[PDB]
Structure of 2-PYRONE synthase:
Amino acid sequence: GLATILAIGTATPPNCVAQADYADYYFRVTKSEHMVDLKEKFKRICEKTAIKKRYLALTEDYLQENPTMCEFMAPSLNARQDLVVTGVPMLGKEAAVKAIDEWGLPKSKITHLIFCTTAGVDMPGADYQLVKLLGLSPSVKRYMLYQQGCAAGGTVLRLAKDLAENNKGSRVLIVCSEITAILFHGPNENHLDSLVAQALFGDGAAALIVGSGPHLAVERPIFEIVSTDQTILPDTEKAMKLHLREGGLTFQLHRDVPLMVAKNIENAAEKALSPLGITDWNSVFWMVHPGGRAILDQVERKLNLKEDKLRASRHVLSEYGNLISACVLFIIDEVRKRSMAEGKSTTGEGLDCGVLFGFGPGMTVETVVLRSVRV
Amino acid sequence: GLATILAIGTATPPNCVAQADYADYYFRVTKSEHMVDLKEKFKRICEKTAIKKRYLALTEDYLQENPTMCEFMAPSLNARQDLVVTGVPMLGKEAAVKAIDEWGLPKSKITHLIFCTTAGVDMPGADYQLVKLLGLSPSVKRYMLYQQGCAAGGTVLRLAKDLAENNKGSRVLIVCSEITAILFHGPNENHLDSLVAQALFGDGAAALIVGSGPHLAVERPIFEIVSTDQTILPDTEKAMKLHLREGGLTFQLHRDVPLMVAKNIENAAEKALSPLGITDWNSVFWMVHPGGRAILDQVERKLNLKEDKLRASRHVLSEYGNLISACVLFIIDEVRKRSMAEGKSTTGEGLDCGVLFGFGPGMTVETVVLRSVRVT
Ligand SMILES: CC(=O)CC(=O)SCCNC(=O)CCNC(=O)[C@H](O)C(C)(C)COP(=O)(O)OP(=O)(O)OC[C@H]1O[C@@H](n2cnc3c(N)ncnc32)[C@H](O)[C@@H]1OP(=O)(O)O
Ligand SMILES: CC(=O)CC(=O)SCCNC(=O)CCNC(=O)[C@H](O)C(C)(C)COP(=O)(O)OP(=O)(O)OC[C@H]1O[C@@H](n2cnc3c(N)ncnc32)[C@H](O)[C@@H]1OP(=O)(O)O
């Protein structure tokens, strides 16, 4: 049958910074208090993000020990890699233990692993580090996805669907783990998109167990993965470019990204839902990657969504920031937890079918349809 | 049916450097002539490689323009990335055009794209650049495999098999493209493995079209992908470690790597071929990632292969050097092309089943079983 999500677990770094305090923290730790107008602008940017708090692996102490990370485009990749090459797999293990505990079956039954991040690279990769950390089978089939960015929560679901459905008995562990230290930069008047980026992202990891043919007495389906699309939005290549250089992961973020999503989003919805005979956008539940608050707003406008349709997406953005590839998988967890807490008839807000969107460089949209599980 | 390889295309950069001249070239362009004894030892290593020439996208002019590439651990990542971020996808496009031309069906029918490299990263990635360059469908489903390493020619086949077999009518384009500029380094006494590494690797890209349910009137099966296995070799973690730093892609490569493969290879063969009822190693054809000449020798000795079983593997090592993730895919093309030129009865040297091995960090071994196709 369809690849089905059987367990979800999430984790974050312990250090939390409130968004209402972030501009002061940031201008202080980067020694940039002399840029008063830019501080004022960043205060405005933070207020607009609709983010309440963010967990960050990057500490004040690490920055003090590695100052170069605060000086715009000074060499600092080695310090970044020193954090994220062990950080990323360790955070991913924390989420994966929770998923494995919820699922409840022996870890020995995990046949495939998909490890996804956008922070650092190394050989052996973070996937190897995860198997050693978790004690998974040395013969587990691995899919190491590096430098993946914000649509890749859709990518992992698209990949896991084919692995689970083509391999009888298989059980796939998905881990997305993101640490934003790779793209932290001090303020610079010529790079306002880079400044904006300092308010957007937080750290986190999500882990899922996915398989077809659930043993219903002991496994608990949460959602089935119905179909996956991936497409490049015409004439949006300039929207987002990020290069891995001696100074860290750089940022080129166009201010019209939200409008580029608005122009294309009804066609991605229609392409996913017309095959199912669904044309009423409010008859389905939505999990929308919160690249920024304005992206959510444009999706709600262009799909003509009731005011609460994107609650679960806005809730994740508020409590954690944009978690890059793990973000939409925190939203799947939010949707199913809230549905159970409210006593809905289904895991997808009492509705039968839902649509998940990931948005990343290219511009790429990943559109995944999920079917709820009747409860 | 089984995922089947339907077309193969390769490409290399134009600049070719003979291995018999590499020691002199290397020590000259890295301005290290005063390291006479290291120079002498580099001549011995190059002689041992069993490599005749390599194609390299890295030029002398580029090195003179970016001198920190030749200074051991000076900051040089940005120069490296400025080369490989455009070079990898362009070189992969040249291989892909050839594969698609062999195939002959419309490029609009490619539904999935697997792009794999071990040289540089960028966002949007090399997969996106390739779609633009080739004019694939904007909706092609992509799998961007970065920092993959020498076992990843087995990886791409493992992944394409599941995508082709689970998606009716799908046709997967696989591209592996490697440019070794990301790991070039000047000589240094305290890093002899990094010196050995300047002699092993060459540049190249391979592209394959894979699909299940071949339309036989117009598509030509080459090999079917029977089974795939990936497994970490016990206690070999420190054998290979490569870090991407301000100075480029570093190297830690242990001298006993060939024996670590030898200790474990018979087991890899047995797990793949026992379920097929096969026990005679000389009854199958073999495609062995030539991580170095000593790896081939150990695999040959430990499996007791006859004298020419590894010919095709030794042949691409000789003509191209170790091409990292694309290396085994050039070997697959060498096997089927040599088999048809000699009039063998099958595309796998006249034999029915074959085993492909990739070896990379972890240590990881990827083992893929291929079934050959009858010629005539
Ligand atoms: C790693 C990945 O794979 C790739 C990723 O980076 S994808 C990142 C995707 N997310 C974003 O692109 C979308 C962010 N956009 C938004 O959500 C909103 O624009 C926002 C929360 C950033 C601001 O909210 P808003 O309603 O647009 O406010 P608005 O007043 O217009 O703008 C905030 C301030 O930032 C500016 N700003 C916003 N986006 C900008 C950009 N990309 N570059 C330059 N400055 C920009 C405005 O110009 C404005 O400044 P002033 O107060 O100095 O006049
Ligand atoms: C990118 C990735 O994904 C990861 C990769 O890099 S995987 C790379 C895998 N490839 C290999 O490990 C190479 C395997 N080794 C080889 O095939 C052979 O050792 C070789 C062709 C390099 C030399 O052949 P050989 O028969 O072993 O010759 P041998 O005389 O013992 O050795 C060559 C010289 O290099 C030295 N050498 C070989 N490997 C060494 C290493 N890893 N570290 C240090 N020095 C080494 C020897 O000590 C010897 O030197 P002297 O003449 O100064 O005494």
